[PDB]
Design a protein around this ligand. Structure first.
Ligand SMILES: Cc1ncc(COP(=O)(O)O)c(C/N=C(\CNc2ccccc2O)C(=O)O)c1O
Ligand SMILES: Cc1ncc(COP(=O)(O)O)c(C/N=C(\CNc2ccccc2O)C(=O)O)c1O
Ligand SMILES: O=P(O)(O)OCCNS(=O)(=O)c1ccc(OC(F)(F)F)cc1
Ligand SMILES: O=P(O)(O)OCCNS(=O)(=O)c1ccc(OC(F)(F)F)cc1
Ligand SMILES: [Cl-]
Ligand SMILES: [Cl-]
Ligand SMILES: [Cl-]
Ligand SMILES: [Cl-]
Ligand SMILES: [Cl-]
Ligand SMILES: [Cl-]
Ligand SMILES: [Cl-]
Ligand SMILES: [Cl-]
Ligand SMILES: [Cl-]
Ligand SMILES: [Cl-]
Ligand SMILES: [Cl-]
Ligand SMILES: [Cl-]
Ligand SMILES: [Cl-]
Ligand SMILES: [Cl-]
Ligand SMILES: [Cl-]
Ligand SMILES: [Cl-]
Ligand SMILES: [Cl-]
Ligand SMILES: [Cl-]
Ligand SMILES: [Cl-]
Ligand SMILES: [Cl-]
Ligand SMILES: [Cl-]
Ligand SMILES: [Cl-]
Ligand SMILES: [Cs+]
Ligand SMILES: [Cs+]
Ligand SMILES: [Cs+]
Ligand SMILES: [Cs+]
Ligand SMILES: [Cs+]
Lengths: 265, 395, 395, 265
């Protein structure tokens, strides 16, 4: 989790927020995915959120559902994802890497064994989308034993008990949820939540769910949050250019450049 | 924290995104409060009796057990308004929704019996109702699609995945995660995140309570065993609940065997799957070696689900209840047997329960046994599917 | 000679070829003997309760009478096993057939509800059952055709005449006139030659007997009026019978108006036909000036009959019961109203009864009145016919 | 009814039974029907049984059902039948004429008025197929007041009460029913019934329902009955030759000749 600590320190000494794109590993194929992610990092991604293809992504709308399907159409397995993660980490030693998991893929071969493999390939954090703080104990204990930060969601209408729980249980960053619903660039902050998290010594906040334009990025940083995550806007650029691999990459680099720039105050 | 235990042994829990936890806690306290409320209970009883038609008959088969020492009764949930047991708990959940000030209903359905029940309760009680149903099930259970739309419900076909119940479940939950302040998610079975497995059992337990009183009156003793099909678990736990502390009574749940367990085309995760986390609960799942949720299969849309409710996984684990499977062909033979020899056209889901009871009789025909089958629905929704089969095989 | 009066005033009688009179006298004495037989009555009651599901609920409408001074109850024969009131008297006639040593059953059907009832009782009680049904009705009520064949009954489409109920009636009677030593003719309504109008009434009178007890318990008084559709007369006389001596209770029978009485395409002979002799009885008939029996019309196959039972002609003549008509369009509007505002999908036959009660309310909405509608069946057999209409008119 | 009395007297003084064909009036058209009936009488018919087209002939199988339909297809009404009956009677002053009615056509305009019209055109008897002796009182009273013989059916298993009733109520001839069922030449006597009817002074017996070959005719006469009626066998000859009117008549004359001959002992 130290990579998150060091990134937020340097972003503080530069007066700017983090831009954190999301992609599903192996979309649309393994080799193109690795190339996409390098292009994201070259265009200015501060950290990564990476999805492992899951058969039933409950928290994802159609854009990221179709990403998962494309990956499965390329035969992408969790095992291949861990080989990709090792190749990304080998190229990028300081970039924080976070996984977006569903619980069955963590629980499947053993929770401890999952986090042990994450540590082996150099993953820094793991967010399990369908595990609330109320069920999190064996996941966050296994995460910490393997130096993985467990990421917790702070939802829009959280009470004080949730705020204090998420502050004490999480590491790396706090996931500031923009709204109810599922992921998507078609459906578009709360300053009070950002400030209560600081009082309780929570990990720094990143806003996600619905961020698709530079303006939304600048808004989050100004609200005092530490940065912002965009999945679907990234993914649709992939979807629209499946037949033009290098037109895809050019459009990805242009988009990420604009989103990154918006985080600079 | 919760007011009630969310687990049955290791099974159950609330594995939903953090955003949905207030909705679940809200539903739990409303249920706990309703269960202590005489006025709620009187309103629920009034709807069960005077609108849905309870108590349902307990019918003694004559013809199909002739020449054996089996006495077989059928608990006639096929006679309930709407045509299946799904109507019982829907009436109770609809009253909970009004108790919470909700005005919309979300529901999933496969056989379309829960969808029909959700639509009729919403028409009666003034809720706006939308229903997800797999596009495959739109077709093989199409009578119920018409029925839901005639009662004012919106019916949304789901074409992703298998186009069966799992994908309708997923779409329902996706919707609720963004509409829960105004919609109540009327989950259709005794599965999903707590408190649904508990609520659904309590709102279906009149099946077994009536059965117990009826059997005692007609036979002067408890049954040797009660037998129910298991799609997600609601009619079986509704039949089981009141017998759980009567340790002499066998509890037998019947999973779909589909084309045969060995083909992998089945719906029997309790006995042939392995524990996993999905649909908000820790429960036996059909899954790949990698943890991907497998597609189930059953001739019966209502059983075609790759998981099972957590109380059944628990009752199995401790040995209080036993679970078996019945193939498509066996269910079809029991369907035909009931039509021709008792004049009752059962749902293909219930036909799996009947098939196992007929096996119990036929395998050991001099064994003295008093059996009750939960006849969870009537078969009008299945006659077109059944006719196309009997014609494909030359009948 | 007969044991019982074959006439109701001038209406009724036994206008059948001489060859059939022994069969009718045989049936009359068996009925008279069964009615005095405690064991018969206990067997009949056992089948009504534990097989068919009686007593049926009496449901209070909430939504559809809002803002009026009408209180409307629905006597839920739609919940009876088989889906309509036709099942009641079929169970009683089947026991009479066994009492006479008969082994085969002949029956006519139009909505296919009597055919379904005849097939299910024959499966249960071990009779061989064959059913005549007009080829037009084979089509617009096809769910019931499948249902009868699944239960082992032979279904014979009748293509002569209108290919509706009259022609199935004719074919049934032709068959019985040459098979009566071994077949019992299970007539499906309270019409035909004596003793059928009497037998069918007595074997349906639990509809009104339960209604009376239920209303007294819920309202502490008798209803202002009971309202039933009239195809041949059985559900209406079953509802009326126990109220006949309560002179304050109105008895309202509803004939199909079809496309409108003035078009001549209707099924309302009691109010718009004239007395004649046919189907073994002297009764109001739709007929030409020359005495040829006219073809009836109704959107509802179960009402599409050019005559009516003789007790209704008599009750009308003396003014004890009043009869009205309801058009196709009015019945369809009441069908939609019930689905959407009470969550019950009624048979299109019963929808005629409902439509008239809704008229009684709407025409005089400050009139205080306590009404019961005989909801004689459920509408699953009608959803495909109704869907093709709503699509033809752009819905 | 005197014409029946005189016919049976002369058939007695000749040692032979009566052959009585049946047709529906106006089948296949009025003019062809009149011609058919003259051909029947020329070929040796002793008396006639004549059907008036009815919409629902309950006692008739498909052959005679189709006769009724053909007549209706030619627009044949009961009124036209009475005009035909008057033309037949005018040509044939001694031939007994019997009508096969259904009750609604008798009751329709008034039972008395029906029998009055029968008397006016010279009809000798009327059999109403769906009126048993138990309902016959207003029909047989109106029949006798207009000198019409009411014909009653003696069914195979009649009891003694029926025998005595039919003996006392009927006139002209007694209809000896061959079997249960409906009319037809596809579905084929009882000596005890024939002799009990004689003891009670019943009108002489004619057997009908299923008689289609000369052998059946000879069998009835030998059993002591006075004759026999054939409807469907006659009608099918009409049905088969609709396109050949004079081939029809040739085949009718040949058939009736053979049936008549069989009645001669
Ligand atoms: C007559 C009948 N009898 C038995 C069953 C089996 O359901 P059970 O009693 O709950 O085990 C059904 C299942 N019906 C479903 C599936 N309902 C469903 C099944 C699994 C997960 C979610 C669901 O909504 C429906 O949507 O109507 C049924 O229709
Ligand atoms: C739900 C329902 N509700 C009302 C009715 C009207 O029949 P009623 O209660 O007898 O007046 C029917 C009539 N159904 C017929 C016609 N049965 C029929 C009608 C007329 C003559 C002979 C018949 O067998 C059938 O054959 O199923 C029905 O299905
Ligand atoms: O920009 P969008 O709309 O595409 O959203 C991108 C989200 N990708 S993610 O990994 O951060 C992410 C984070 C949390 C999720 O579910 C949970 F909140 F329930 F935990 C799902 C996805
Ligand atoms: O030779 P078939 O089989 O065609 O029979 C010819 C019969 N024609 S008929 O007028 O004598 C005749 C006589 C009686 C009938 O019905 C009744 F017996 F109920 F009264 C019907 C027709
Ligand atoms: Cl970078
Ligand atoms: Cl912390
Ligand atoms: Cl636990
Ligand atoms: Cl309680
Ligand atoms: Cl209480
Ligand atoms: Cl008790
Ligand atoms: Cl007992
Ligand atoms: Cl396999
Ligand atoms: Cl594994
Ligand atoms: Cl098994
Ligand atoms: Cl034993
Ligand atoms: Cl009289
Ligand atoms: Cl009695
Ligand atoms: Cl008694
Ligand atoms: Cl009483
Ligand atoms: Cl009261
Ligand atoms: Cl007109
Ligand atoms: Cl007239
Ligand atoms: Cl009217
Ligand atoms: Cl008033
Ligand atoms: Cl001559
Ligand atoms: Cl005489
Ligand atoms: Cs009941
Ligand atoms: Cs038995
Ligand atoms: Cs299942
Ligand atoms: Cs009211
Ligand atoms: Cs009618």
């Amino acid at each position: 989790m130290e990579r998150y600590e060091n990134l937020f320190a340097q972003l503080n000494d530069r007066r700017e927020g983090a831009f954190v794109p999301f992609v599903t590993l192996g979309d649309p194929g393994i080799e193109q995915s690795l190339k996409i992610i390098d292009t994201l990092i070259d265009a200015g991604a501060d950290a990564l959120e990476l999805g492992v293809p899951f058969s039933d992504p409950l928290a994802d709308g159609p854009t990221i559902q179709n990403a998962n399907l494309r990956a499965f159409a390329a035969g992408v397995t969790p095992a291949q994802c861990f080989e990709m993660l090792a190749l990304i980490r080998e190229k990028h030693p300081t970039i924080p890497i976070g996984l977006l998991m569903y619980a069955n893929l963590v629980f499947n071969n053993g929770i401890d064994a999952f986090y042990a493999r994450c540590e082996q390939v150099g993953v820094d954090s793991v967010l399990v989308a369908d595990v609330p703080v109320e069920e999190s104990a064996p996941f966050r204990q296994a995460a910490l034993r393997h130096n993985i930060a467990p990421i917790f969601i702070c939802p829009p209408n959280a009470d004080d008990d949730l705020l204090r729980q998420v502050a004490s249980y999480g590491r790396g960053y706090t996931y500031l949820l923009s709204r109810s619903g599922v992921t998507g660039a078609e459906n578009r902050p709360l300053h009070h939540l950002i400030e209560k998290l600081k009082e309780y010594h929570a990990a720094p906040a990143l806003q996600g769910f619905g961020i698709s334009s530079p303006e939304q990025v600048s808004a989050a940083v100004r609200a005092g949050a530490a940065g912002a995550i965009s999945g679907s806007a990234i993914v649709k650029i992939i979807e629209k250019n499946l037949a033009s691999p290098k037109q895809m990459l050019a459009e990805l680099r242009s988009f990420v450049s604009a989103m990154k720039a918006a985080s600079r105050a | 924290t919760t007011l009630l235990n969310p687990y049955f042994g290791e099974f159950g829990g609330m594995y939903v995104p953090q955003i949905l936890m207030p909705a679940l806690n809200q539903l739990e306290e409303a249920f706990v409060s309703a269960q202590k409320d005489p006025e709620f209970q009187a309103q629920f009883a009034d709807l069960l009796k005077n609108y849905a038609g309870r108590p349902t008959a307990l019918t003694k088969c004559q013809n199909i057990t002739a020449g054996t020492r089996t006495t077989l009764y059928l608990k006639r949930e096929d006679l309930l308004h709407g045509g299946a047991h799904k109507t019982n708990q829907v009436l109770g959940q609809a009253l909970l929704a009004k108790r919470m000030g909700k005005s919309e209903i979300i529901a999933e359905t496969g056989a379309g019996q829960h969808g029909v029940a959700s639509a009729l309760a919403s028409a009666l009680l003034g809720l706006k109702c939308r229903i997800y149903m797999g596009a495959k099930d739109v077709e093989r259970q199409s009578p119920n699609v018409f029925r839901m739309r005639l009662m004012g419900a919106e019916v949304i076909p789901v074409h992703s995945g298998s186009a069966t119940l799992t994908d309708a479940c997923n779409e329902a939950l996706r919707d609720w995660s963004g509409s829960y302040e105004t919609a109540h998610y009327m989950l259709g079975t005794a599965a999903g995140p707590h408190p649904y497995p508990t609520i659904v059992r309590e709102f279906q337990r009149m099946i077994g309570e009536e059965t117990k009183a009826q059997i005692l009156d007609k036979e002067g003793r408890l049954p040797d065993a009660v037998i129910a099909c298991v799609g997600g678990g609601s009619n079986a736990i509704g039949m089981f609940a009141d017998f759980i502390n009567d340790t002499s009574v066998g509890l037998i749940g019947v999973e779909p065997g589909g084309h045969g367990i060995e083909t992998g085309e089945h719906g029997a995760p309790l006995k042939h799957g392995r524990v996993g986390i999905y649909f908000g609960m820790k429960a036996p799942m059909m899954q790949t070696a990698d943890g991907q949720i497998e597609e189930s299969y059953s001739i019966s849309a209502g059983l075609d689900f790759p998981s099972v409710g957590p109380q059944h996984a628990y009752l199995n684990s401790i040995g209080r209840a036993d679970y078996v499977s019945i193939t498509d062909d066996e269910a079809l033979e029991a369907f035909k047997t009931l039509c021709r020899h008792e004049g009752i056209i059962p749902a293909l889901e219930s036909s799996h329960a009947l098939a196992h009871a007929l096996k119990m009789m036929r395998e050991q025909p001099e064994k003295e046994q008093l059996l009750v089958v939960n006849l969870s629905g009537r078969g009008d929704k299945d006659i077109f599917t059944v006719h196309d089969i009997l014609k494909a095989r030359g009948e």
